[PDB]
């Protein structure tokens, strides 16, 4: 599978597109308006320049990756691609429309994959007549660098479809891991409550921000502490993920701290608002 | 603090002996049998050679260090020490008696600190009449190398004992962090439940061992995955800590999985037994 259709062209779409293109795939990327696609492309172009300045790749590799990527708003261009990776907005109604339409359009061979962090693949695939070829392909930000893809098997995802997505992932130099679908998969299910735990510690006056983080970094060799990491993932995202784990499981274990909900209601979302657990400046 | 008494010639107490001595403190290490003390002094000795091999230090340094360390099995030898660091077995009734004993032996100014991961500094302090001078000094294995020390204030630990242990942590080149005593402090309170969650992920069929650990390594940039890390800490230790956190809080969030109890009951404790989540060799 060398021809890849990617829907959406924000952070993860752009990153995913680059990931596929950088290892020689032909990639079409589809967004809604035309300035979105352009942005997605300029995003990727800025990222590759950062790789050239690092002397990680040549200016020629950059032009070549770019040469492998095309923009469109036409969903019909999906019809002859080997893999679709949907990385549009995290809304179930819409993902179900996208996947239905994609079911109509694409040849019967095409595998259809979502990059959703928090929505059920099984539920998405149920909107199609291709459940055996719907699958989750959950990448990690920034997708061109991070080597993991959680490969999320829905209830009806075939062995054959999993094996194909696995080889496809290795073919672009990523390490796929098989996941029977469950909330939070593996990574977010471990990582996020670890961040929520650091909010509880703080809320219960056990220790202060800088200390909680130094402790995780020096005591556990984590490259960044949990609170900084929350500020970096976004506190709204952290909060939404603890809510999904809690609503899906009914398990009081995944209850978010009151302090986290308050920071999100203040708009203290982290870096991207210049304030979360830490105050930031440009 | 010129002079340090350490209880325990085991893994940690040997490591803590080394951490102090190697920065020029005198140290008296006390265990309950000579064999043990000997074992301990050999361990510092072989660890100091290793440094020597890589020209981290020369022989004169090594033996200069070794000359600062004396062994004993008599508690009464703590009478002139400036700081005690108790790293004996994790058992309340024993710690209480040690600390009662130390309170009788030591000059009024000596600070009594414990390296306990899971017992209340405050309860230990109440077995003495010098609660203001009792504190936890929680090091990380290997104590020579790992920089962090969680400094754990009991309810009655004074500002001046805190300030003193802080300066002393720094003076041996460690980074102290202030902790108001609560179960699991900071590090283990985040880290251990993370390993327990991975055991839950495994028990519920979500994904297999190696995949869980590649996920956390490649998806979150953690230096090791949590299952391997559990095997390294010892699953008996993971379980005990989840059990303290659960009995101390009454919160079901910290309930250990059944898979964890089962592995512990099989003797599959980790590397130390040659088998935990993974099978090991030599
Ligand atoms: N760090 C992360 O953002 C991250 C990591 C892993 C997974 N995810 C998941 O990836 C998905 C996308 O997240 P993102 O961060 O790129 O969001 P984003 O908001 O930055 O980008 C979403 C893009 O999808 C486009 N879009 C909306 N409706 C569309 C449609 N019908 N067709 C084509 N494009 C459409 C939008 O125009 C937008 O450009 C979500 O499912 C999210 O849960 C995100
Ligand atoms: N990784 C770790 O081992 C680790 C890390 C952080 C904290 N701790 C804590 O530090 C303490 C020691 O654990 P360890 O791993 O070194 O155990 P260990 O079994 O390696 O050594 C404990 C030593 O204490 C000795 N001992 C028992 N009763 C004693 C007494 N009354 N006086 C003097 N010595 C006595 C034993 O002879 C033994 O050699 C525990 O409280 C534990 O929770 C351990």
Q: Which residues of A touch B166 (CB under 8 A)?
A: none
- Cβ neighbours of residue A152 closer than 8 Å, sequence gap 6 or more: A121, A135, A136, A137, A138, A179, A181, A185
Q: Which strand ranges, in their side-by-side order, compose the sheet holding B175-180?
A: B69-72, B26-30, B3-7, B83-86, B111-114, B134-138, B148-153, B175-180
How many of the other CB atoms lie within 10 Å of CB of A168?
Answer: 24
Strand B148-153 relative to strand B134-138: parallel, antiparallel, unpaired? antiparallel
Asked if the Cβ–Cβ distance from B215 to A253 is below 8 Å, we say no
Closest ligand, as measured to the CA of B86: 2
Domain boundaries, chain A: 1-187, 191-276
Q: What residue of A is the nearest CA neighbor of B185?
A: A206
Q: Any chain A CB within 8 A of the CB of B211?
A: yes
Q: Any chain B CB within 8 A of the CB of A245?
A: no
> Which of A143, A270, A144 shows the shortest CA–CA distance to A195?
A270
| Three-class DSSP labels, chain A | CCEEEEECCCHHHHHHHHHHHCCCCEEEEECCCHHHHHHHHHHHHHHHHHHHHCCCCCHHHHHHHHHCEEEECCHHHHHHCCEEEECCCCCHHHHHHHHHHHHHHCCCCCEEEECCCCCCHHHHHCCCCCHHHEEEEECCCCCCCCCEEEEEECCCCCHHHHHHHHHHHHHCCCEEEEEECCCCCCHHHHHHHHHHHHHHHHHCCCCCHHHHHHHHHHHHCCCCCHHHHHHHHCHHHHHHHHHHHHHHHCCHHHCCCHHHHHHHHCCCCEHHHCECCCECCC
Asked if the Cβ–Cβ distance from A190 to B194 is below 8 Å, we say yes
Asked if the Cβ–Cβ distance from B214 to A189 is below 8 Å, we say no
Q: At what angle do helices A258-265 and A235-249 cross, to 10 degrees?
A: 130
Nearest CB partner across the interface for B140, out of A179, A182, A219: A219
> Which of A62, A69, A55, A48 shows the shortest CA–CA distance to A5?
A69
Cα B130 from Cα B154, distance rounded (Å): 12
Is B13 labelled as part of a ligand binding site? yes
- What is the resolution in angstroms? 2.3
Cα B252 from Cα A253, distance rounded (Å): 7
Q: Which residues of B are catalytic?
A: 117, 138, 150, 188
Cα B282 from Cα A103, distance rounded (Å): 54
C-beta of residue B26 within 8 angstroms of C-beta of residue B2: yes
Is A141 labelled as part of a ligand binding site? yes
CATH of span A1-187: 3.40.50.720
Q: A114, A188, A196, A257: which one is catalytic? A: A188
What DSSP character marks residue B186? T
Residue A17: cis peptide before it, omega within 30 degrees of 0: no
Cα A252 from Cα A243, distance rounded (Å): 10
Asked if the Cβ–Cβ distance from A208 to B147 is below 8 Å, we say no
Which residue in B186, B198, B216, B251 has the most chain A C-beta atoms within 10 A of its own C-beta, making it the best mutation to test that interface? B186
Q: Do domains A1-187 and A191-276 have the same CATH topology?
A: no
A87 lines ligand 1 (CB under 6 A): yes
Is A11 labelled as part of a ligand binding site? yes
- Cβ neighbours of residue A265 closer than 8 Å, sequence gap 6 or more: none
Beta bridge partners of A112: A84, A134
Q: Any chain A CB within 8 A of the CB of B221?
A: yes
Is A47 labelled as part of a ligand binding site? yes
* Atom from ligand 1 closest to the CA of residue A9: 39
Q: How was it solved?
A: X-ray
Cα A150 from Cα A175, distance rounded (Å): 8
Cα B135 from Cα B160, distance rounded (Å): 11
Q: Nearest CA to CA, how far is A106 from chain B (Å)?
A: 30
Determine the topology of domain B191-276 in CATH.
1.10.1040
Residue B142: cis peptide before it, omega within 30 degrees of 0: yes
Closest ligand, as measured to the CA of A121: 1
Q: Any chain B CB within 8 A of the CB of A140?
A: yes
């Amino acid at each position: 599978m060398k021809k890849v259709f990617v829907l959406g062209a924000g952070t993860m779409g752009a990153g995913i597109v680059q990931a596929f293109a950088a290892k020689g795939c032909e990639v079409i990327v589809r967004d809604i308006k035309e300035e979105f696609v352009d942005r997605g492309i300029a995003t990727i172009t800025k990222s590759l320049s950062k790789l050239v300045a690092k002397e990680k790749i040549t200016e020629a590799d950059k032009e070549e990756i770019l040469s492998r990527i095309s923009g469109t708003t036409d969903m019909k261009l999906a019809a002859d691609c080997d893999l679709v990776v949907e990385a549009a907005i995290e809304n179930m109604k819409i993902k179900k429309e996208i996947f239905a339409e994609l079911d109509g359009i694409c040849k019967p061979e095409t595998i259809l994959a979502s990059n959703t962090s928090s929505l059920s693949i099984t539920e998405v695939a149920s909107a199609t007549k291709r459940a055996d070829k719907v699958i989750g392909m959950h990448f990690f930000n920034p997708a061109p660098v991070m080597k993991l893809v959680e490969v999320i098997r829905g209830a009806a995802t075939s062995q054959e479809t999993f094996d194909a997505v696995k080889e496809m992932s290795e073919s672009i130099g990523k390490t796929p891991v098989e996941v029977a679908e469950a909330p939070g998969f593996v990574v977010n299910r471990i990582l996020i409550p670890m961040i929520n735990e650091a909010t509880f510690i703080l809320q219960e006056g056990v220790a202060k921000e800088e200390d909680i983080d130094a402790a995780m970094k020096l005591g556990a060799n984590h490259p960044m502490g949990p609170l900084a990491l929350g500020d970096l993932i976004g506190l709204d995202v952290c909060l939404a993920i603890m809510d999904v784990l809690y609503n899906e499981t009914g398990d009081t274990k995944y209850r978010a701290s009151s302090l986290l909900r308050k920071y999100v209601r203040a708009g203290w979302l982290g870096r991207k608002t210049g304030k979360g657990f830490y105050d930031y400046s440009k």
